[PDB]
Design a protein around this ligand. Structure first.
Ligand code: DHC
Ligand code: CA
Length: 290
């Protein structure tokens, strides 16, 4: 569905269990049922009115467990319940939905930077591996447009990436696309109109406020207006033809700042701030609870 912006887990001193929902209609937040396990560098998505939290890591004071977890949140009940886990733990995961099916992309397992990719069947509650990406990517940005899944940037273990690639499901194939103008890991990646947006991230030197978009038709990346705050490991989603960026690290602060991009006016504005500063959250949109 679509009515609230849910932000699940994230990081500040350690991984966090928070689920809170923003209402752009009235500027209001709700605190909702905590994740059963705290998680940073996870991804959110939504299928048939249920919110999913996928992978990440528990950076606790008593150890650092990378997650293979798929946890399901029903806003009708305000409860989390476990779903089938993935083949492997994926911290700094990218996630995308094609026709009711969830794709989990790359991310890290301790030292290991994954190229692997796997697909969840909600009704059957089963995961199956698909074709690996051409490139190992963690902190990868992942978005779906026209039933094609795009994997943008991240970190291959040695180099941060400007590269990007496209999964064609009918062929179970990955092809390279035009690289970005800017090297980005931990970028906020989403879809709006006929473009894949890569917002912020890290180029190896500094946190970025630049936003560029890929036209799937023309195959070019153009910069748009930048965000006010430089950010990496930011949350990103789309509601009512607008990009929302939540949180991130600017090099000095875990930002509580929420920016909104208007593609009509090519401008960003501050629309609220989160109850607390935090990085590496999952974000997605569904019906309001209860
Ligand atoms: O207007 C903005 O928001 C973007 C521009 C910008 C902001 C900060 C910098 O350090 C910089 O080189 C460029
Ligand atoms: Ca490796």
């Amino acid at each position: 569905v679509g009515r609230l912006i849910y932000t699940a887990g994230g990081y500040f001193r350690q991984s966090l269990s928070y689920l809170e929902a923003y209402n752009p209609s009235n500027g209001s937040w709700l605190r909702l049922a905590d994740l059963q396990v705290p998680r940073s560098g996870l991804a959110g998505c939504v299928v048939g009115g249920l919110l999913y939290a996928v992978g990440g890591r528990n950076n606790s004071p008593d150890g650092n467990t990378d997650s293979s977890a798929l946890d399901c949140y029903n806003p009708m009940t305000n409860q989390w319940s476990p779903c089938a886990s993935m083949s492997v733990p994926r911290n700094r995961i990218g996630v995308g939905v094609i026709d009711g099916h969830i794709y989990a992309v790359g991310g890290s397992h301790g030292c290991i930077h994954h190229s692997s990719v796997e697909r969840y069947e909600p009704e059957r509650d089963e995961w199956h591996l698909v074709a690996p990406m051409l490139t190992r990517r963690i902190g990868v940005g992942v978005a779906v447009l026209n039933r094609l899944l795009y994997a943008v940037g991240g970190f291959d273990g040695t180099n941060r990436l400007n590269s990007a690639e496209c999964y064609y499901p009918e062929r179970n194939e990955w092809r390279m696309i035009t690289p970005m103008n800017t090297i980005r890991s931990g970028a906020g990646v989403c879809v709006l109109h006929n473009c894949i947006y890569a917002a912020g991230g890290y180029d190896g030197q500094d946190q970025l406020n630049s936003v560029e978009r890929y036209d799937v038709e023309t195959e070019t990346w153009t910069f748009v207006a930048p965000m006010r705050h430089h950010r990496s490991a930011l949350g990103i989603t789309v509601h009512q033809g607008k990009i929302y960026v939540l949180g991130g690290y600017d090099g000095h602060t875990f930002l509580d700042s929420v920016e909104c991009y208007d593609p009509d006016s090519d401008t960003w504005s501050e629309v609220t701030r989160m109850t607390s500063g935090r990085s590496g959250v999952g974000v997605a949109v569904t019906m309001e609870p209860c």
